[PDB]
Amino acid sequence: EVEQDVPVDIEGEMSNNSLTYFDKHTDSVFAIGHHPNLPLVCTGGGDNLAHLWTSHSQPPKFAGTLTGYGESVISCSFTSEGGFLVTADMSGKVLVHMGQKGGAQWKLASQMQEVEEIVWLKTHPTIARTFAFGATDGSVWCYQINEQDGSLEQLMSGFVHQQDCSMGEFINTDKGENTLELVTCSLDSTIVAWNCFTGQQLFKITQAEIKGLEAPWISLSLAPETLTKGNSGVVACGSNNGLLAVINCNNGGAILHLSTVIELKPEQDELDASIESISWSSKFSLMAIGLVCGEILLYDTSAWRVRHKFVLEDSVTKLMFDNDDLFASCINGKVYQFNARTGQEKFVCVGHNMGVLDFILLHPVANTGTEQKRKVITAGDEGVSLVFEVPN
């Protein structure tokens, strides 16, 4: 089997292939979110603002501005049932907006300023009115939103991590609404799983459990039940120095795989090995990992061997699998589309003259007969969101 590099390209290629856009941001578009059911987009930004606008219209229909941020809005996250909108900035402010008048108006329900800076905040993918966030002090917080008014409800407030709590992901999502599990990571090379309700550490991986190795963590990704066969707790972790760990959250964080992704040169920035994004093909049993050096390493989840390597002109910012395809946002300003199965560069989103920091994948809800194109909405370093019709 695999010992040989199998790279593809990314061939070297005013245009602009964009469909429509959003330029209300007067600095970088940091966060990008979308309503579960409504065609409502939410952008966060370097301008201390969160803007709402429609995905369905060319040009987007402007739905208003959410205000009260003390710094850069670094997270726009909707609730599972879509009737609440969690917002979080780099001054530690969190804001809850309640979907009013059919989801048109978004009244400010509640807010908090529990930390000095939030590093990330996601909402529960299945469990209604639930969210969690991590701070620069390494604290992990989990809250619930009251269905009536939108009053906050704290579940846990764990100060386990030593460095900044880098990222987190909910697990065992499909395993009920009374089963709130969350995995968080930090720069002190620590990974902890928690029972959001009780608030206690299920398990805690330290430097000791990983061959002693110093590994400041940066990204986490949950493997869907379709490449685990019922294991709703398989998480992929990637360090800032190239270490990739795959954990069995259900067997006390058992290390299924632990390896360096790239063998860096002496000269090469130690950072260039940073695993900036992780994603799994739900359909296919593959696991793409994106590096600062612009390398994408598509793994076969069974063998745990690299299928295809991809080199980009700049840093990978976000990897996202959709159906048969692999999408990649690069700091050059391009969003790239690949055939996960084959490696074949399907399409390239062009237009941004500054890095694409984040993205979303929109789907044609209606297959009454005619099946429209999937959409790609981006978060631009320039403070512009672009809409792209993408093949299939």
Q: What CATH number is associated with residue 32?
A: 2.130.10.10
**Which stretch of DSSP H or E encloses residue 289?**
strand 286-291
How was this structure determined? It was done by X-ray
This structure's resolution (angstroms)? 3.3
> What does the CA dihedral 193, 199, 202, 208 come to, rounded to 10 degrees?
70
Rounded CA-CA distance 195/134 in Å is 15
For 239, the token pair is 């360090």
Residue (of 224, 230, 237) closest to 193 by Cα position: 237
Q: How many domains does the chain have?
A: 1
| Whole-number CA gyration radius for the chain | 20
For 298, the token pair is 């598509």
CB 119 within 8 A of CB 72: no
Residue type (1 letter), 313: E
3-state class (DSSP) for residue 48 = coil
Would strands 201-205 and 191-195 be described as parallel, antiparallel, or unpaired?
antiparallel
Rounded CA-CA distance 302/223 in Å is 12
Rounded CA-CA distance 248/232 in Å is 9
Residue (of 111, 165, 157, 158) closest to 134 by Cα position: 165
Burial class (CB in 10 A: 0-12, 13-18, 19+), 93: buried
Rounded CA-CA distance 268/293 in Å is 9
Q: Which residue has the tokens 């593959």?
A: 286
CB 228 within 8 A of CB 234: yes
CB 375 within 8 A of CB 58: no
Q: Which residue has the tokens 């509640």?
A: 110
Residue (of 293, 269, 267, 289) closest to 280 by Cα position: 289
Specify which residues 105 forms β-bridges with.
100
Range of the domain at 156: 1-392
Backbone angles phi, psi at 102, to 5 degrees: 65, 10
Burial class (CB in 10 A: 0-12, 13-18, 19+), 260: middle
- What DSSP assignment string belongs to 138-192? --EEEEEE-TTT--EEEEEEE---SS-EEEEEEES-SS-SS--EEEEEETTS-EE
**For the chain, the helix, strand and coil percentages under 3-state DSSP, each to the nearest 5:** 5, 50, 50
CB 306 within 8 A of CB 285: no
3-state class (DSSP) for residue 378 = strand
Specify which residues 194 forms β-bridges with.
182, 201
Q: Find the farthest-apart pair of alpha carbons in the chain and give their distance in angstroms, rounded.
A: 59
Rounded CA-CA distance 148/43 in Å is 26
CB 296 within 8 A of CB 316: yes
CA 5, 11, 12, 17 torsion-angle sign:
negative
DSSP class of residue 272? G
